[PDB]
């Protein structure tokens, strides 16, 4: 047994000393994109990969082969979409060029990136039994998009998978498919956007144009977000994806403590930096089952901790402004006290 512990520590130093020869490769499957609510495809924190310790100078064909065996899929029934970190702070699936990129090593394909994250497109093994296969993809003339539905009622995003389609296609021709995937009746009146990056969510105006023209900088892994064109949306809190990604971009968590209760640990509230007095007051009053009119809030002292000046209710400002004196680390807190009836 003591020998076996000398073989265990020893072999693990080789792997430590050989790790510079190896790279990790993180595979992510479309199931992982389901029910994600944030920008792009998935949350890097909540995502679950299928990892692979792989030789830096090994060939692609080798990985492809290996993969097909580990996961359990034919080699012609899977396609790889390497994840790309773009200039604009998004991470999307990008293409990879089998033909021109056929006789290159792994590490170089990652562009010296490690770990290297890769989207695995496989045919649903359920639909695969029923005669289906992974379609052909004219790199030059087809594009791969991703579809997201937004429900203003629930204020949520519902992944609707990806589609291959030809670049030349009109947007009007992809409406059915969107309706279907979202489970709407055909000829349902929709509203479409491009998720471009966080905070930026441009509306698509002319449907009767080619995809080329319709998304500024068309590329694979572009994301169309769509919803119902319905009056009921006005009722909601966030009728557009555009608004959603704002609330999300400006989402920030704030702790609230009773000034009158010494050392009160208080309660967090998730709020938006572009709120005004009213929106912050009304939020917290819902969390205290109280009239907002009975809440007095207090500004930040900047340097010292503890409640500062008493915040008047005609405060023309935004929460960004209230929080502006908290270092990145510093937890974001605001003091309040209740008033009398």
């Amino acid at each position: 047994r003591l020998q076996e512990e000398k073989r265990i520590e020893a072999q693990k130093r080789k792997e430590r000393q050989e790790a510079h020869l190896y790279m990790q490769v993180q595979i992510v499957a479309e199931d992982q994109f389901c029910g994600h609510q944030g920008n792009d495809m998935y949350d890097e924190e909540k995502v679950k990969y299928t990892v692979f310790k792989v030789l830096k100078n090994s060939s692609l064909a080798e990985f492809v082969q290996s993969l097909s065996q580990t996961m359990g899929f034919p080699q012609d029934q899977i396609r790889l979409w390497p994840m790309q970190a773009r200039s604009n702070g998004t991470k999307r699936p990008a293409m990879l060029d089998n033909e021109a990129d056929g006789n290159k090593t792994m590490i170089e394909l990652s562009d010296n990136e490690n770990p290297w994250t890769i989207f695995l497109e496989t045919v649903d093994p359920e639909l695969a039994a029923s005669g289906a296969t992974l379609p052909k993809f004219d790199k030059d003339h087809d594009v791969m998009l991703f579809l997201k539905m937004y429900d203003p009622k629930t204020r949520s995003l519902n992944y609707c998978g990806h589609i291959y389609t030809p670049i030349s296609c009109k947007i009007r021709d992809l409406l059915p498919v969107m309706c279907d995937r979202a489970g709407f009746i055909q000829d349902t009146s929709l509203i479409l956007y491009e998720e471009v990056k966080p905070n930026l969510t441009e509306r698509i105006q002319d449907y009767d144009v080619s995809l080329d023209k319709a998304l500024d900088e068309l590329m694979d892994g572009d994301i169309i977000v769509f919803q119902k064109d319905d009056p009921e949306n006005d009722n909601s809190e966030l009728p557009t994806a555009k608004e959603y990604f704002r609330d999300l971009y400006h989402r920030v968590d704030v702790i609230f403590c009773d000034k009158t209760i010494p050392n009160d640990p208080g309660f967090v509230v998730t709020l938006s930096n572009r709120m005004n007095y009213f929106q912050v007051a009304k939020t917290v009053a819902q969390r205290l089952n109280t009239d907002p009119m009975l809440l007095q809030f207090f500004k930040s002292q900047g340097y010292r901790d503890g409640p500062g000046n008493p915040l008047r209710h005609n405060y023309e400002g935004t929460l960004r402004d209230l929080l502006q004196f908290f270092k990145p680390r510093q937890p974001k807190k605001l003091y309040y006290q209740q008033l009398k009836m």
């Binding site: 604009n88 003339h141 670049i167 990056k197």
Partner: peptide, 10 residues
């Protein structure tokens, strides 16, 4: 024909 971009530039 109609192509996609190589690179996003915003």
């Amino acid at each position: 024909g109609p192509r996609k971009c190589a690179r996003k530039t915003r």
